[PDB]
């Protein structure tokens, strides 16, 4: 009965998976809260990967948030807290006016157990970037568990992974010193299980190379969506996206030199 922001996650585990989704490449991040929902972008420490989040008001059993508020917080701390909450728990975000902190209430069906944590906010001078929906040369999509395996496999061979989309065909290559690694997957659609289908909307060929380390970090969003969208263009950062019932977690990875 004393707040300017009061959201209540349908599932506690959600906000955790959402943050464990990128708390390894980004440390400090500003969460912009408004009427419709929560939005947040943050650049990598090496300034190579841009991370953008979007949590729609449809992910909360109840979402208030009167005025627009900025919640700058350290993901390592916030992560320690979320780790507290158990299964049968309704995580509720709470923020007063011009906060210095933030409360995370872990209630339970059985009103005989209540656990609330306070988290001191950070002062973040975010270099706000202008992300604009672009027209990428190629736009594929595949199971996140697969993209994960592929990325993990190849990363053992090289520090760089080349993604080639030629003649409607997805090809990942890794050329190291010990040897090379090549994986190719052709589009299809299994009506048996639509989620295991490989899509591909090419318009122009694409040959980009990404740092293996950043892909190993992006594949961590493979707990939010069973599928991963990848949009590539010779003149722009790659875009890896995971879909959330009410939003998404997207990554913009800058390529290497030609």
């Amino acid at each position: 009965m004393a707040s300017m922001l009061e959201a209540k996650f349908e599932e506690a585990s959600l906000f955790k998976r959402i943050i464990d989704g990128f708390k390894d490449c980004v440390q400090l991040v500003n969460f912009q809260c408004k009427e419709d929902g929560i939005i947040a972008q943050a650049v990598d420490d090496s300034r190579v990967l841009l991370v953008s989040l979007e949590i729609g008001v449809e992910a909360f059993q109840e979402y208030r948030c009167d005025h627009p508020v900025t919640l700058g917080m350290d993901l390592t701390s916030l992560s320690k807290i979320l780790r507290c909450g158990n299964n049968t728990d309704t995580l509720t975000l709470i923020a007063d006016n011009t906060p210095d902190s933030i409360i995370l209430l872990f209630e339970d069906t059985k009103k005989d157990r209540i656990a609330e944590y306070s988290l001191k906010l950070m002062d973040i001078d975010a270099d706000f970037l202008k992300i604009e929906e672009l027209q990428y040369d190629s736009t594929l999509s595949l199971p996140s568990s697969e993209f994960s395996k592929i990325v993990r496999d190849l990363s053992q061979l090289s520090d760089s992974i080349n993604i080639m989309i030629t003649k409607e065909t997805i090809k990942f290559v890794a050329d190291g010193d010990i040897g090379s690694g090549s994986v190719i997957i052709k589009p299809f659609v299994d009506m048996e299980h639509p989620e295991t289908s490989i899509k591909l909307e090419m318009d122009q060929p694409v040959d980009l190379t990404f740092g293996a380390k950043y892909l190993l970090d992006i594949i961590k969003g493979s707990s939010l969506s069973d599928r991963v969208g990848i949009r590539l263009s010779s003149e722009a950062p790659a875009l890896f996206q995971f879909d959330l019932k009410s939003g998404f977690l997207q990554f913009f990875l800058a390529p290497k030199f030609n």
Partner: protein, 316 residues
């Protein structure tokens, strides 16, 4: 419980410090405004540094001291790790404060902070000076790496004059209804050499064991060569006489060879009777012997040569 008076009567506001007036006022003003620069407060033991900074901390943050001040002293972990995390995290902390106020980080006993750590502190207080300000307290600023030094104001503190020591001494006397003597107080002043803490501590130990604070009682807890005797030894008209004072009243009574010299120096210093030129040549001698005592040769012989050389000068 046994509340030490050094703690019980610790200045809780910049006003109560009988410090270095000039400098303290400088602080009083920063307390009213708020543009507190990073600063290194250095000086001898017990003159009011740690008190000072903490008092400045309050008048600046009031009810905010609790969340806007982070103290880290020699009893805490202050290595590379803590500096790169705790401290950094604090400066990055969000805390809404009045226009000219900033969070304060107090690193006391800063001359104990390893260089590597200080080195990792540099960038933090440079990048977040707009919300966080640092205060370093030490005896040797010499131990603060220069990069940190150039980032802050250096405030030197001076030993407390006997007058100042005397004032806070009486203030405590009234609030404790302590039975004192003028000579008794002169004994404390004389044995605290500008150290308020030292003075108070003694004062209490003196009352705790003799109630009445008189020279005799004071020098009892101090248990060092009584100034009077030491004096009567340095002024003896005959070298034979003074050597007897050293033999009968000092050495035979079991006082440390270090104890003898130190007092001798202290007494020679206040020997108004003698002349500046003279007291100094003596000191030069007492010191030479002193350093000899420190190099191991703390023999009776040495003390004798000391008095001998004294007379040679006080006769020429």
């Amino acid at each position: 419980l046994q509340l030490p008076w050094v703690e019980k009567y610790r200045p809780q506001v910049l006003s109560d410090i009988v410090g270095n007036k000039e400098t303290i006022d400088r602080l009083q003003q920063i307390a009213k405004d708020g543009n507190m620069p990073h600063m290194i407060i250095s000086g001898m033991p017990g003159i009011g540094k740690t008190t000072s900074v903490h008092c400045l901390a309050h008048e600046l943050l009031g009810r905010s001291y609790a969340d806007g001040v982070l103290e880290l002293n020699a009893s805490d972990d202050r290595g590379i790790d803590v500096v790169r995390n705790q401290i950094k995290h604090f400066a990055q902390k969000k805390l809404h404060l009045p226009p000219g106020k900033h969070k304060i980080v107090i690193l006391d006993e800063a001359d104990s902070m390893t260089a590597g750590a200080q080195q990792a502190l540099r960038r933090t207080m440079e990048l977040y000076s707009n919300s966080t300000r640092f205060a370093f307290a030490c005896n040797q600023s010499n131990k603060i790496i220069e990069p940190l030094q150039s980032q802050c104001a250096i405030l030197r503190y001076s030993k407390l004059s006997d007058e100042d020591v005397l004032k806070r001494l009486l203030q405590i006397i009234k609030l404790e209804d302590v039975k004192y003597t003028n000579d008794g107080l002169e004994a404390i002043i004389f044995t605290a050499e500008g150290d308020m803490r030292q003075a108070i501590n003694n004062l209490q130990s003196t009352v705790a064991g003799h109630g009445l604070v008189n020279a005799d009682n004071v020098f009892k807890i101090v248990d060092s060569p009584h100034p009077l005797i030491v004096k009567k030894m340095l002024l003896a008209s005959n070298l034979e006489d003074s050597i007897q004072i050293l033999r009968t009243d000092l050495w035979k009574k079991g006082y440390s060879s270090i104890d003898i010299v130190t007092t001798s120096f202290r007494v020679t210093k206040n020997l108004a009777q003698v002349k500046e030129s003279v007291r100094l040549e003596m000191i030069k001698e007492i010191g030479l012997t002193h350093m000899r005592i420190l190099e191991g040769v703390g023999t009776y012989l040495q003390l004798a040569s000391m008095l001998a050389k004294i007379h040679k000068l006080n006769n020429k």
